Structure formats: C-alpha cells, structure tokens
Design a protein around this ligand. Sequence first.
Ligand code: C2E
Ligand code: C2E
Ligand code: NA
Ligand code: NA
Length: 279
Amino acid sequence: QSLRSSLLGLRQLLRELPGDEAPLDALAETVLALLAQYGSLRIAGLYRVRHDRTPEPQPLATLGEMPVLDADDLLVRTCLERGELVSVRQELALQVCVPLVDTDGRILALLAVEQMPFFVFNERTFSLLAILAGHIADLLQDIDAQRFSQYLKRSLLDARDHGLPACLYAFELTDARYGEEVQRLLEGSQRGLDVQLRLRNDEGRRVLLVLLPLTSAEGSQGYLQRLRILFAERFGQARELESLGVRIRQYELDAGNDRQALGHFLFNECGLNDQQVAV
Ligand SMILES: Nc1nc2c(ncn2[C@@H]2O[C@@H]3COP(=O)(O)O[C@H]4[C@@H](O)[C@H](n5cnc6c(=O)[nH]c(N)nc65)O[C@@H]4COP(=O)(O)O[C@H]3[C@H]2O)c(=O)[nH]1
Ligand SMILES: Nc1nc2c(ncn2[C@@H]2O[C@@H]3COP(=O)(O)O[C@H]4[C@@H](O)[C@H](n5cnc6c(=O)[nH]c(N)nc65)O[C@@H]4COP(=O)(O)O[C@H]3[C@H]2O)c(=O)[nH]1
Ligand code: NA
Ligand code: NA
C-alpha cells in the first residue's frame, strides 16, 4: 500500500521534468532509493541495460560502497537472459539481481545488490522488489490507449506472478442526454494509477473503461460506492446512476483469471476490439 504513494510520487516526478533529459537518467537516484527502502538494501547499484540486454558498466546510481560491476557475473547474466529477479542460493559478490522489465519484456535497467541484511533475504522481499521494479519500468516508458493497455498488461502480470488483484469497470453510456456529463464526472473522479479510456463499442455506444490496478474486491466496492455518492451529488439523490442510461460491467482480475477470460470480457461482452485495447 506504501506502494501506491511511491509510484504516485515517482509518476509526479516524471511528469514535472524537462525533455532535456531521459527519465531513467534523471530519476536514477530516486528509483534506487525506492528500491533500497523496500528491500532495506545496504549496498547496491542501478544500471542502464542496453538494447542487447547487457548492462552499462558505469552505474547510474550507487548505494554504499558498491564494487565495479562484473558484466560476466553469472547472476547478472542469468537475470538479464531470463528477464527475472535472481538471487544466490541462501545456503551460500552479488546477492541478488533485479531487472526492471516493462510489459513488453524490454529490460530498461538492472538493480544489482551487493549486500542486504540476512533477514530480508527472502521471497516476500524478492517479490516486493520485483513488483516495484516492473511498475517502475512501466513509468519510465494513442497516449490514453497506449497507457491503458500497458497498465492492463501490468495488472495481468501482477495477478499471474504475484496474485495481486485488479478491477476493470466498463461504463456503457446509453443515454446521449447524460453521456458527456457522466463521462466528465467519472474523469474528474480519477485516482492516480487508475486509468480510464473513452471508447465506442461495436453497437456505436460510448463506453468509459476504468482500470483499478492493485485493487481488491473490497476496494472496488469502496470505489463504486464512492461513485454513487458523487453521482447523487451531481444529478441529485433522487436519481440512480442507472436511470441516466448507464450500464455497468465489472471484471475482477485475479490469480484464477486468464488473458483469454479477460479478452472475452473486453471483446465478446463489452463489444470492443483489439485495435482499441491490446491484450
Ligand atoms: N474519497 C476518495 N477520493 C479519492 C480516492 N482516490 C482518489 N480520490 C480522488 O481522486 C483525487 C486524486 O487522487 P490521487 O490522484 O490518487 O492523488 C491523491 C493522493 O496522492 C493524495 N492522498 C489523499 N488522501 C490520501 C490517502 O488517504 N492515502 C494516500 N496514499 N494518498 C492520499 O492526495 C492526492 C489528492 O487527494 P484528493 O485531493 O482528495 O483528490 C483525490 C480524490 O478527490 C479515494 O480512495 N477516496
Ligand atoms: N483504485 C481505487 N480505489 C478506490 C478509489 N476510491 C475508493 N477506492 C477504494 O475504496 C476504499 C475506500 O474508499 P473511500 O471510501 O473513499 O475511503 C478512502 C478515503 O476516505 C481516503 N482517501 C484515500 N485517498 C484519497 C484521496 O486521494 N482523496 C480523498 N479525499 N480521500 C482519500 O482514505 C480511505 C481509504 O482509502 P483506501 O485505503 O485506498 O481504500 C479505498 C480504496 O481501496 C479509486 O478512485 N480508485
Ligand atoms: Na454494456
Ligand atoms: Na478483435
């Protein structure tokens, strides 16, 4: 949950820097700091990874007395070949390598850990570094549609690799009298990290997709409940959201879901296509 704030705080940093510098370079220190905090790291470095999946030897940022990086170190190479976090056998001078991998499988950067306290050298920690690293990779990377598809892929990976839930709402706006105003209300209701996408379904109707990443069934209930109150303010208490021609479809992503089940929701049920949302 501290996760929300960190990502949100980073996203803000991204949005408020000049083009006169690539994000990874400007935010190297911040990114390392985030990772250092979540893994209670003591000695580590952050490195750019090249298109050819080899790291730039010169670190973007370091923490403590980080040694020169050995690019031929098997741990680095195994991490970079697999695109996955790798750690040394706990029974047995890097201790862990964590790649920053975006949703397309491109590796942007490498966290190399020389030392972390023995007692945070476990799967729960590794999981957290890996979750955070993937999200960070995303942020470093049609605007609205591209972003929506990326975040959606991220959520699929998070549910699949880590069992983290997410929720997808589709708001079909069937009464043109209120369509624009309903959308405006939803857009103004937006939490950072949540993403929205305006579309037209195959029946020619306006649809507003809302993706709530990292959000449990209870969270999605809290959200919708917050919305009904906003709606009651905007169109009066006497009026229900549905009486404004709004139809709700909801899809919970979780460990037991699949890309195929999600596609069925987007295309078969919501009536969208893969030119609108990439799965
Ligand atoms: N009632 C409610 N409204 C929500 C919720 N999530 C988003 N919103 C609404 O969406 C706006 C933006 O949220 P944010 O982008 O995540 O950005 C937020 C967030 O960065 C931060 N913030 C405020 N309260 C909290 C909080 O209880 N926890 C965390 N982690 N951050 C908060 O302040 C920013 C703006 O806060 P707001 O001015 O209130 O403005 C909020 C609020 O109007 C929610 O769970 N409940
Ligand atoms: N993904 C997503 N989830 C949402 C949204 N709105 C509500 N939820 C979920 O519903 C729970 C309770 O919402 P809340 O009643 O507004 O109760 C909120 C609200 O009162 C307050 N809060 C958090 N963030 C903000 C904010 O940015 N602005 C304001 N005004 N209040 C916030 O803290 C309470 C708890 O926040 P949470 O622990 O995060 O728990 C939230 C959250 O899991 C949303 O726009 N997006
Ligand atoms: Na519908
Ligand atoms: Na299609």
